[PDB]
């Protein structure tokens, strides 16, 4: 269950949109990144419960939309800017400075293992899919074969290397080989439900395990060789619990969701049970949720923008 362990108030006079936890740098140390529309800050632990701001980066014109975590990168922070759709992706680093990484009609973006960042733009025959690498500066850009169906989300497949998954506007799932750039397979998912947003994908025994969001989450099991979907697991709110899925995050085998309620709900994905509820503190509905990438914590944020950090065990 959930133990409130620390917290972060960020009276930034700007709407808070996202948070994430990463290791920074001459030594790995767990930090928290907060993003508001017009400012992004890096924070370190002041003591057992308090956080202090170490760096800040400012954005005028186009508002910050999300943080984009990149596994195995500790010397910069990537963010996506845009009012609704993504227009730019920037890298923030230190004395604070920033670099424009990509610019245009961006539809989807995902940080990948080993310092890569994948993104896609356009919609059809115009679609491009690109994976860049950081050393770290703009080093390589490999195109991937586009499915010419708008990509809605990426997910790196846990349990293999070099497999990348996408979902498309067509309710299709695509798999690429990250090494060759090849599009290996396209597979339609029952025309609903339906999703659209893949939170996590796993490979085990030649089967694909795919977590989507609606029943608050769905696990679809697909045989990649036949293309056929082989079963489906449901994650549902307990006996009495109002609320529909609104957004969420999955780390390893845990899933968190912000419900239309305003409550956050948690599942262990192995077992399928809702392992905790977390009502809004005060009257402030939870605005975003993210698992910590450095440790065993759940980050829950309000537009306020106060962040509450819980210990999961």
């Amino acid at each position: 269950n959930l133990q409130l362990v620390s917290e972060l108030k960020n009276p930034s006079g700007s709407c808070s949109v996202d948070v994430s936890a990463m290791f920074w740098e001459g030594c790995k140390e767990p930090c928290i990144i907060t993003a508001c529309e017009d400012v992004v800050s890096l924070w370190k632990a002041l003591d057992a419960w308090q956080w202090e701001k170490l760096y800040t980066w400012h954005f005028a014109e186009v508002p910050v939309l999300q943080i984009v975590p990149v596994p195995d990168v500790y010397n910069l922070v990537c963010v996506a800017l845009g009012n609704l759709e993504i227009r730019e992706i920037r890298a923030l680093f230190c004395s604070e400075k920033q670099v424009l990484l990509k610019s245009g009609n961006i539809k989807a973006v995902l940080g990948l293992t080993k310092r890569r960042l994948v993104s896609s733009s356009g919609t059809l025959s115009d679609q491009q899919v690109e994976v860049m690498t950081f050393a770290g500066g703009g080093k390589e850009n490999q195109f991937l074969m586009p499915p010419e169906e708008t990509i809605l989300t990426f997910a790196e497949v846990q349990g293999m290397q070099e497999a990348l998954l996408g979902t498309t506007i067509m309710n299709n799932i695509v798999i690429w080989n990250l090494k060759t750039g090849q599009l290996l397979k396209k597979m339609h998912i029952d025309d609903s439900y339906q999703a659209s947003v893949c939170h996590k994908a796993y490979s085990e025994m030649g089967l694909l395990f795919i977590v989507l969001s609606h029943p608050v989450f769905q696990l679809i099991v697909i045989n990649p060789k036949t293309t056929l979907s082989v079963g489906v697991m449901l994650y549902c709110l307990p006996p009495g619990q109002a609320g529909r899925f609104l957004e969420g995050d999955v780390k390893d085998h845990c899933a968190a969701a912000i419900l239309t309620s305003g409550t956050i709900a948690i599942w262990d994905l192995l077992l399928g049970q809702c392992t905790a509820l977390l009502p809004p503190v005060s009257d402030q509905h939870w605005s975003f949720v993210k698992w910590s990438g450095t440790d065993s914590h759940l980050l829950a944020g309000q537009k306020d923008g106060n962040i509450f950090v819980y210990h999961y065990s």
Binding site: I175, N177, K185, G206, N223, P224, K225, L228
Partner: peptide
């Protein structure tokens, strides 16, 4: 009888 292939990935990559 939907066959499962534990090597589907390198297979298609080949």
């Amino acid at each position: 009888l939907g066959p499962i292939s534990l090597n589907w990935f390198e297979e298609l990559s080949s």
